[PDB]
Amino acid sequence: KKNVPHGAAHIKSTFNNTIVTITDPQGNVIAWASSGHVGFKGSRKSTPFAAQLAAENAARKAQDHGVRKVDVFVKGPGSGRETAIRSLQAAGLEVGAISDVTPQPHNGVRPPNRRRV
Amino acid sequence: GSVIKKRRKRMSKKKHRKLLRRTRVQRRKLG
């Protein structure tokens, strides 16, 4: 019963996963279908195919609640950063404004030890 | 191969420290 025509697609594309959330402009999530939600597991959730199915699922579920017009906040150093937003484009949302919101620490918390692989 | 010269010293020092740690108690603290 919650009807809102405008929204924001927050996209988090980490080296393992992609998470697409559709919120109102105020910032209240409605749909969040992610790369595990679309059938995937393990290392296959890092792939752009999983990205462009998770974004499609999020887009359709958000349209079911009535969003035509989304603006995208993308974040993360993952490979599903463009496949996802074209998936939202081609699943019926209008892309609107595109930004980048990847956090940039002003040399704050000490990072974990480098992998000796 | 100048690192070999460091490795011999390293092994000798390592074994000496291991012996001291084997004896940081009345094994050696009495003596």
């Binding site: 995937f40 296959r44 792939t47 752009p48 195919f49 999983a50 | -």
Partner: protein, 155 residues
Amino acid sequence: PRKGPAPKRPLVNDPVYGSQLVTQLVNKVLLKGKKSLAERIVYGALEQARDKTGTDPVITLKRALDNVKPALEVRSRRVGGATYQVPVEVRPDRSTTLALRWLVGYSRQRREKTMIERLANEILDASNGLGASVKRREDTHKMAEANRAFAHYRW
């Protein structure tokens, strides 16, 4: 090999049928050098077929081949600690040859007396979409579609 692709071999038109796919399917069927034998087998299959088809036999065989033609296969590759498969598009000259090679392989194990009418009913049931190679088409297809996620490694 290393120095580009190798030239293919031309295949001349069939005398009985003004078509090349018969001339190439018979060569697939060929084993140990009995061109005569394989040719009479293919011709007997089509000439047995026309009675139960009514349609021209090469038209029927084209209908079958359009069914059993592959589009996208499951070619393997190992990258890290685990090998997996890659969905890759199949060019038509490979696809038709693979399809009719499947036809020959599964007609060598189908349940009738002898291979003349074995291949004959193979052709008609592949033109009608019910056969063993037919079901291989849509099981290899779904196996490759379940690995489309790895299509981003195209060598």
